[PDB]
């Protein structure tokens, strides 16, 4: 009924519920910066600082998801998740930081990916719970 995999799915679900709002706030910050003296400079630089800050969390939780789904013998979800891992790796290698288009497109794609992984985890947990 539990099988220890429903727990990994619950945890990933709770974290993606935050990631979706995180990506939404990225999109809204991009819409704000789309406006393109000290007032605007600060009002944009503070948001840019909040952005440049929240980068380690995504990598951390993605590594967490992959590690968990690897230790739970669930290789399907790991295969679904590794593409974003390689994407984050290449980003760390070379990330643009002109840059607005790439940023908003990556944000939208990652948002859709997280929103779909939400339902994927939900359905997988539901299936695992009633697999008696």
């Amino acid at each position: 009924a539990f099988t220890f995999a429903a727990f990994c799915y619950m945890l990933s679900l709770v974290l993606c519920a935050a990631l979706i709002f995180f990506a939404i706030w990225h999109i809204i910050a991009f819409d704000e910066l789309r406006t393109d003296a000290r007032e605007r400079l600060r009002n944009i630089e503070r948001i840019c600082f909040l952005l440049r800050k929240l980068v380690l969390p995504e990598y951390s939780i993605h590594s967490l998801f992959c590690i968990m789904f690897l230790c739970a013998q669930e290789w399907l979800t790991l295969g679904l998740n590794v593409p974003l891992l390689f994407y984050h790796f290449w980003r760390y290698f070379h990330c643009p930081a002109d840059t607005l288009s790439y940023c908003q497109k990556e944000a939208w794609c990652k948002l859709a990916f997280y929103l779909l992984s939400f339902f994927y985890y939900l359905y997988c947990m539901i299936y695992t719970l009633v697999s008696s």
Binding site: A1, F2, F7, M10, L11, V14, A18, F21, N43
Partner: protein
């Protein structure tokens, strides 16, 4: 040649059974069972064709205290109505003084039957059983009250109050976790040092599990005529039954022990116990070794010529393992079924449930706080 040797038997399963379509078959092919293949081998050895028959009275044999007459297959043999019996016939003294039993083709005795302990289903929130919810609610509200008081204290007095609340909370949580742990350890230990049964004495001593037998038969007769301390005590107990432990039919005992949880046991021939354990719903099991020692044997008139050949064949088959083969066939191959200590997650699921619930609630609170802060500070 021969004269189609008569073979009187009885309809007891799995010894002899009617095929699914006996209404469209001949006698020898009509029935089927251990005894049937046994008779086939006996014929193959002695070289004679036979004709099977069932006993009218549906009994084995006994002497009426008034007529002193032999009934059942015993009478059918003594009174010429039968030439030989290939049915399970418990060898006895009175029964041996009139006929020439063969050697035991199947040894057995008295054994026990109980409910297979497959009852293991832990509640989701079973970890709260060690102590009442009336305490869990107190614990929760004490936690929140202590947090509130610390907030107040170190807010309007930015110590001593903090030190003393810390000490009292230390004491409180100490005692609480220790009480929970100790009661849980008591539960586990008690549940651990309970050996269900390993023998009759395990029943003679205890009383929670009642042991019963048939209304009247060889079992109760053996118990009455017993000179053993354990069996004497068990007979005294059954004589002191309240309610009645006895029954008038084995199926009644089976049904009531299946209905009972774990507090009833049935005594019977180990053979039927095994056959049942290998039958649906497969909820019973045989555990204790046979108490007594007896055996079934082939019968024949006291002055018949078959005796020698049939005894020789029985011994030959017991040495060749053919009887063991037929047993493994009609008890296990024909079976309706094939045949820990640590803690499983099922006992702790609620813990992780509430954990994830709290984590999600905290994430929600953090998100709404972040929004109500940023939006209401930066712009409005």
């Amino acid at each position: 040649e021969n004269k189609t040797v008569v073979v009187t038997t009885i309809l007891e399963s799995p010894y002899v059974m009617m095929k699914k379509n006996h209404e469209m078959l001949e006698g020898n092919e009509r029935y089927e069972g251990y005894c049937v293949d046994l008779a086939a081998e006996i014929a193959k050895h002695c070289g004679f064709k036979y004709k099977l028959t069932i006993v009218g009275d549906g009994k084995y044999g006994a002497r009426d205290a008034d007529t002193k007459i032999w009934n059942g297959m015993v009478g059918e043999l003594v009174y010429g109505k039968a030439d030989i019996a290939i049915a399970p016939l418990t060898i006895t003294l009175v029964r041996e003084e009139v006929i020439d039993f063969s050697k035991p083709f199947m040894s057995l005795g008295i054994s026990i039957m109980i409910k297979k302990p497959q009852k293991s289903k832990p509640g989701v929130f079973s970890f709260l059983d060690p102590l009442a919810y009336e305490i869990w609610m107190c614990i929760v509200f004490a936690y929140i009250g202590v947090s509130v008081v610390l907030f107040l204290v170190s807010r309007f007095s930015p110590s001593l109050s903090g030190r003393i609340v810390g000490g009292v909370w230390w004491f409180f949580t100490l005692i609480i976790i220790s009480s929970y742990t100790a009661n849980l350890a008591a539960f586990l230990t008690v549940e651990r040092m309970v050996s269900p049964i390993e023998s009759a004495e395990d029943l003679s001593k205890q009383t929670e599990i009642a042991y019963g037998t048939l209304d009247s038969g060889s079992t109760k007769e053996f118990f009455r005529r017993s000179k053993i301390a354990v069996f004497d005590k068990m007979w005294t107990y059954m004589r002191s039954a309240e309610p009645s432990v006895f029954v008038r039919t084995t199926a009644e005992g089976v049904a009531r022990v299946r209905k009972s949880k774990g507090k009833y046991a049935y005594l019977l021939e180990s053979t039927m116990n095994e056959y049942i354990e290998q039958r649906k719903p497969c909820d019973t099991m045989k555990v204790g070794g046979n108490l007594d020692s007896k055996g079934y044997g082939i019968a024949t008139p006291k002055g018949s010529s078959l005796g020698n050949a049939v005894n020789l064949a029985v011994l030959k088959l017991n040495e060749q393992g053919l009887l063991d083969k037929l047993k493994n066939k009609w008890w296990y191959d024909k079976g309706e079924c094939g045949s820990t200590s640590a803690l499983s997650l099922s006992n702790v699921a609620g813990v992780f449930y509430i954990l994830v619930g709290g984590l999600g609630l905290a994430m929600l609170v953090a998100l709404i706080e972040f929004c109500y802060k940023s939006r209401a500070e930066a712009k409005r």
